[PDB]
């Protein structure tokens, strides 16, 4: 089931999130200063999701921004480097603390080169999601039923994926390395917005 | 004496000269830690003098130096600490912390140039001239040549002054918090290199 | 329905074009000084098309060239950079003014890398066209029925595609950037014919 | 006085010296406008003298200079205006027009060479010698060095004469209309760069 | 139908070739000094082919070599640059004169990038051949029926392909350019054997 | 049929190997100092296999290590360069002597670019194996039935593949070159562990 | 007189000096024939003197020179004739034949080096020193500078001697027949370049 | 006499000077053995003198030299023997064994540098200066120039001393067994090059 919102999540539906917050975003493209934030989706892990539609030029969302900046509740992304930069560009908020399931996948799933959400979900959870609506118009006047289902499917399994990946990082001894990556991720995202988006700051160049 | 020479470990007396930040560099047999052994460790307190410590083959202990490296009350200054931190962890098992990297700081504030080596940084920021001719030499040699000893000392003699200059630039241009976060992740970046992620950015897609 | 012509469109069938002119060409290849113009197709947007067969060495087509140079009627291409250069190389005419639906696609469809006509037509218009006859012999002595249908299908939907893309450029605020691109397109095509065809003149090299 | 120094904006008296085309260049902290702030704006009327205007950090207004930049009755001469036009639009919100780019003109008529930088263009077309040693310096410095001031002025002192030489070449070789169309699209090319199309030709397939 | 021979074609079956000779070879690989010639197939254009099995170290084939060096009978290859070098390396014979249908394809079929035999045969002749046996062991003790059928299919249509391509080169005005290419082809092949196999001798380097 | 072992092969099941030993390994990835050895599989060529599960941090396996270092029994790998390095990294043993069927494939199957085990097995032996379980979690608490079947299938045909490839190396005269490659292979693997893993030591750089 | 200057075409008297092979080079406005016009044609009979012929813009006729170019009884010597043959065919419609290319000959017999330019070939084979500084100049200039005239003449003054030296090398190393076949295909190679195959080898798969 | 010249083969008297290892290099017409013929073979016993043997065109026999090359009781020292071993096998059919390659040894122990050429190795290990100017010359020349003869001799005069220096480094850094295995495979590596595997590592996946 999906709860649809315009502009911001209701304070009522924000209270359902008493722990970690699974979160994803939908934009018009991969360049934040060019392609505006259109949708942000949330899920508390109970099999339901909140889908919030963002309007052009909208620069505030009090209930959502409070959840994002809340240091007592962890935020779960799959490749948070992009979403953290977009949310900071749109609302000026620094999402923290974070768990990135793609960084976790790269650190423990060393036997494969597939670290996208789709391949992670079927190997670790035996869950099949579709990638058909990823390249659609997320700024449409009316989000299609398939678009709303795709957006929710991006957050409905992030809690369970994090738990399975965390057990792998424990088994293979890289949980501290992953924790250090999550602490730097907000800085990595802010460095992307400033023009270092295609260079590793820790390299020689 | 401008250069204090030590065999195996720094003396406790000279280790007491370091009441604050410690400038540090290393010399190895190459750029692969699991292949090329650590040969020299050079330190400087910033007063124009340096300690040069010769590391023997197969040596896995240096308690006086290792204590300074792990001491969270004294900051360690490197130029491209990503490599040296990895060599020190591979050799002694010590995680150097906390660190300041003048190369990361240079890439974050000297945005008008692509020259981020130590020689170029010392030339612009401090008008100091150093030569890099002895970097490709046998650092495991029987006896280190005098030219080798001066190159090793000159690699740490100006790191204090360079850090001060670059810190003022990061504060002026508003990226001191970005650099501090980079320094906190640097020991993890080095440990990921030792594990085989040395040629990939862990924060990228692939 | 398709109206076939040899050498030039009839003055009768040119009068059906009281507004924008959808236009495409078919050649023997992508190098204009090597591969001759074989077919030029037109459509006024009513669901019908004129298909004009061009003979080797033919250097004039009065009714068509008058339409191309007419500044009161807009010409619609999908990737006009190629067709404008070919028409200028064959007839010495500078087609103006132009609307390029591929430039428009690149400027507003920022969520995808597919900017060809086929993917544009199905997303924006839900229209499916075949690309089977694109790599055929367009200098054949008799154009096949499939060739004539492929040629017409390249212009039958350019009016409706332009309208949908224009609404997107309006919604996303890049209609002035697209208009500036269309004004430079004839110069970009002429620069290609002179040997700058593989370099961006606005770059350092 | 060969160099007129200004703080923040050009004086109204010196702005009156520009009755025709305005040669113009900028100095920044780097090549990324959203990261590297605008530091200096240099102008020259073509009489051998230059105005050098220091731009403060966070400054978003310069009415006397901005009026000259937007004035459609006076042409602005750049060398690679694609970058400067973007920096000026990002800093002041002004769309510089109309413009002449001696680099675009050089690439369109000097077809016998791949050297299209300003130094090479001034050497062949005018036999003028300029040095580029100070381009990689701190242009946000506390006080601009005299070598910095002369480099900044020399970047605009010859743009009038270079434009005249290249215009005669474009007329002779029959591509003045191609260059004029390139100049008309240049402000859009710069704005597309600021939006993230900076490393792609919008007129290509991909 | 296929006529099988060991070592050399019979003088009887060589007399069936009163005109152009379609010819192809099969080897153990693409490096002539490493991978030996295993099979050479011939066809006179009547729908039948001679398939000659070559033994290891065999350095003579009088009836075949006489056909190859015969200047009165044209030899047809598809990409003769390879086969001419192999035949010269094995028997010391310089095949001349030649018609290469791949060079002809590259010169007149300017609307496509597919210049292999398979795509040439279906577009120009509406003939479908299989490429399944191309990467098999041609030095096997017994050539399989599929291997013999694949080898013959490489020469059964070279006459008809040459005729259709020659008409295209005539129509598009590059028949003299193709003739000049065929005259240089034996030198191009000999230059390959000497180590210039990966550089264009007419370039700067 | 498959014989499962934990930690080491039983001395009873080691006595079944009176000749060459087919052997493969399964790891958590391709970097030995990062990805631990999980499984090593053996087969004597009778159609049955021993599958030994290796525990994390386990640094000894007496019965297996004795087989690996036994100079009187040849060890057969497909691409032994990787497995020899992993076994030397885990147990400190130098496997010798070895026959690598991938080196043999590259030296005699000169007509193809496919030198993996799957393509080698179907061409030379007409045997079809699946590659589905290659990218699985080999450090799982319980190896799946499909994982155990995949692991055994990697060694069940190495004897027969070696024999067929050895006959090809004899026929084409490169058996001495292959023998020289096998003698250097343990050094090539040890050079990989020391950081020369992406450079050919015999090149200029 | 070491350099004979001509406007438009070589005089009939000076054309009579060429009883055998003709060394020839051209100067253009660039490397794209359909964009960059032919400016100068230089010839030399091998006696230490050269004819330098200035080609006007839009000129499509030069009967005295064109006759020498098409004359199958006199061989034309180029260094990288692939380009010049294309420029001459595009400008005058003449197919230069027969030709000898000292660059193709150099690549076929000087197998011990990668330096196949004219300057390197003249240095090793003849110990002649020529400079290439004037190759990137305005050859359509109002008046050709004296340095331009000497560079143009020096490009043809030694082609006879270089051809003789390289021919003896091709005969010695057994590749004179390979070079002769390359020379016979060269006019077709140039015409394929003018048609858009300029960046592909027609004898390759793609 | 510092250089002993021979035509076709080394004399039996001078071949008797080699009681131990034989330093050896070759000069060819290029880097492709099947195209570029062997021209010179240079040997040195390590006493400061060298034998320089001119190889005629089409020559396929040199019994005195070939016996030294195949002699398993005397080691042959090359710098990058991979090429010379291939040229010798292609020319005479001899498999040179056993061999020591100072380049392979340099890449295995001089891990602090990327400069593994002979000139750089002689400069660091022995402080000997040699020039490489004559490597790109006509070694099939009518008469070898004196500069050619000295370059050829200097390529073998120091291989004994260089091998001794590098052997001590391999023993010190623990990779003498790796180098010995590389030397044993080297003749096979060269023969694979002659068969068309010259641009691929046979030990890689592809
Ligand atoms: Mn998503
Ligand atoms: Mn996402
Ligand atoms: Mn360092
Ligand atoms: Mn250092
Ligand atoms: Mn079309
Ligand atoms: Mn089109
Ligand atoms: Mn500028
Ligand atoms: Mn400037
Ligand atoms: Mn075939
Ligand atoms: Mn073939
Ligand atoms: Mn396996
Ligand atoms: Mn394996
Ligand atoms: Mn030339
Ligand atoms: Mn020239
Ligand atoms: Mn050598
Ligand atoms: Mn040499």
Numbering used by the authors:
A (entry chain A), C (entry chain A), E (entry chain A), F (entry chain A): 4 to 208
B (entry chain B), D (entry chain B), G (entry chain B), H (entry chain B): 3 to 208
Paper text:
The Agrobacterium tumefaciens genome contains two homologues of RNase D, Atu1151 (denoted At_RND, 30% similarity with full-length Ec_RND) and Atu4108 (denoted At_NrnC, 31% similarity with the N-terminal 184 residues of Ec_RND).
In addition, nuclease assays indicated that Tyr153 is essential for At_NrnC function. Indeed, in the structure of the active state, Tyr153 was located at the typical catalytic site for DEDDy enzymes. According to the superposition, the two Mn2+ ions were located on two sides of the DNA backbone, which is similar to the case of Mg2+ and Zn2+ in the Klenow fragment structure.
